[PDB]
Structure 1
């Protein structure tokens, strides 16, 4: 980097308005996609969480791991049942999901982050009853139907969670939690991140995705938008690809719940978190209420 020093200066100085806005605040980050599978992006993500924490910002990580679960099920020769396009989560599939999410995928992020200090701590809803789940149905070609032990976040121990954060820790959340009877369900990571963000009074929700941002008329490149209100985007929802739906519903639930902004950012960009939070050069889509 033979770039002149007087320009390295202005780039750092231009972070100041967002350092002020985020100082002392909770930022919830959904981590998934290629930012989770490529080692250079992986290590940049962990470094950015250490960054936030060494600015006195309070990052909270919620992670997915859909593909890793199905690979483990294939390795174990566990045959799936499928209603619509959904695998049914039997007690057996849940045990596998839990052990992959919490005992594999969560662990690598904890150790990556912890390469910068004693920051990361892995948690599920079962730990200290931090949050509960309610069983969810899906609608397949009409009819709402049961697909097993799959839920939404029900209640969140907001107080206990913020203590963890105020102590300097970076929670890395694996989305599993007990229902009211103690039966552990798997929760979609995108919706769980929205619920955590709302419960914790987060200042921002970040959703790492494998796309540049929200297109309204995909694939027209002219259709990429950089900011949008919830009213307009809720109207656009039925239009989007199957992959963008959960990310967009998360931002709707979050920002309607009072989180000031939710962002869909490009997880294939190194240090996308830094770019989105501390420069005005972000590719992402910012969702505000209206």
Structure 2
């Protein structure tokens, strides 16, 4: 990076300006998961980019997953799973584990990484200050809607209290657990929770970190990779994508139809992917806009 001439270093920074202007004072919700969460270089870069946004006057909000870590802890505790379709049933016991891992392990690692740069990160769940509630959700296996326990969707969000937190200069790191109307805590899918938080907060962008270059229309045709697409036609392509990018795509449509100006599916295996997606035009991701 030292053999690179100085006048091109200048140019790269100057080309950030249109996006610094767009994002200044705005909320950006980031779904964090995948390899961006498991490799130590990626992780550290992610935390530094969160500090970057904050030290530009941008208001990042982090929503994290943790599927594989929950599973490993269940196996360590010898908790036998029940499975309907390909879904583990979330008993009261599985939820206690899920909450303890998400909030007391996975969330903690990110908060500490970010806080290496300053007193920025703060961890929360829907339980704290009743920041958001959940509604129990069913799944459809082999055509029939079925109960798989204490798993929900975000119901309502405390928009005011959450925007207080970010105006104080803090970076919320959200673990997706929240209680229903009777106080019963549910585990929420991180991808959908992020889209819901983004719409409730009036975010300027939603970013989804995933382990992909971007959205392929006809995977695996390499020339099917797309850089921008509207919600109308993306909704039509939904039943034709692999099972893994379904929830990431649904989040994007749900957020952009909710009024979030754009959602982005970006490559979490790229170091500093947030910086490249937000402050350069050389992004590999896929941008979703309404239409």
* TM-score for the superposition, normalised by structure 1: 1.00
**C-alpha displacement of 1:152:** 0.1
Q: Deviations over 1:109-153 (max 9, x none)?
A: 000000000000000000000000000000001000000000000
**C-alpha displacement of 1:164:** 0.1
Q: Deviations over 1:57-96 (max 9, x none)?
A: 0000000000000000000000000000000000000000
**C-alpha displacement of 1:54:** 0.0
After superposition, the CA RMSD in angstroms is 0.2
Alpha-carbon distance in 1 for matches of 2:242, 2:80: 28
Q: Deviations over 1:98-118 (max 9, x none)?
A: 000000000000000000000
SS in 2 for 1:11: helix
Aligned to 1:147: 148
Q: Deviations over 1:3-56 (max 9, x none)?
A: 000000000000000000000000000000000000000000000000000000
Determine whether 1:77 maps to 2:78. Answer: yes
Q: Deviations over 1:196-233 (max 9, x none)?
A: 00000000000000000000000000000000000000
Alpha-carbon distance in 2 for matches of 1:62, 1:228: 24
Alpha-carbon distance in 2 for matches of 1:141, 1:266: 32
Q: How many residues align?
A: 290
Aligned to 1:247: 248
Alpha-carbon distance in 2 for matches of 1:36, 1:142: 34
Alpha-carbon distance in 2 for matches of 1:273, 1:72: 30
Alpha-carbon distance in 1 for matches of 2:256, 2:162: 20
**C-alpha displacement of 1:187:** 0.1
Q: Structure 1 regions of 5+ residues with no counterpart? A: none
**C-alpha displacement of 1:2:** 1.2
SS in 2 for 1:40: helix
Aligned to 2:60: 59
Aligned to 1:216: 217
**C-alpha displacement of 1:276:** 0.0
SS in 2 for 1:46: helix
Determine whether 1:287 maps to 2:282. Answer: no
Alpha-carbon distance in 1 for matches of 2:218, 2:241: 9
SS in 2 for 1:181: coil
Runs of 4+ residues deviating >6 angstroms: none
Alpha-carbon distance in 1 for matches of 2:241, 2:145: 21
SS in 1 for 2:154: strand
* TM-score for the superposition, normalised by structure 2: 1.00
Alpha-carbon distance in 2 for matches of 1:111, 1:85: 34
Q: Deviations over 1:211-256 (max 9, x none)?
A: 0000000000000000000000000000000000000000000000
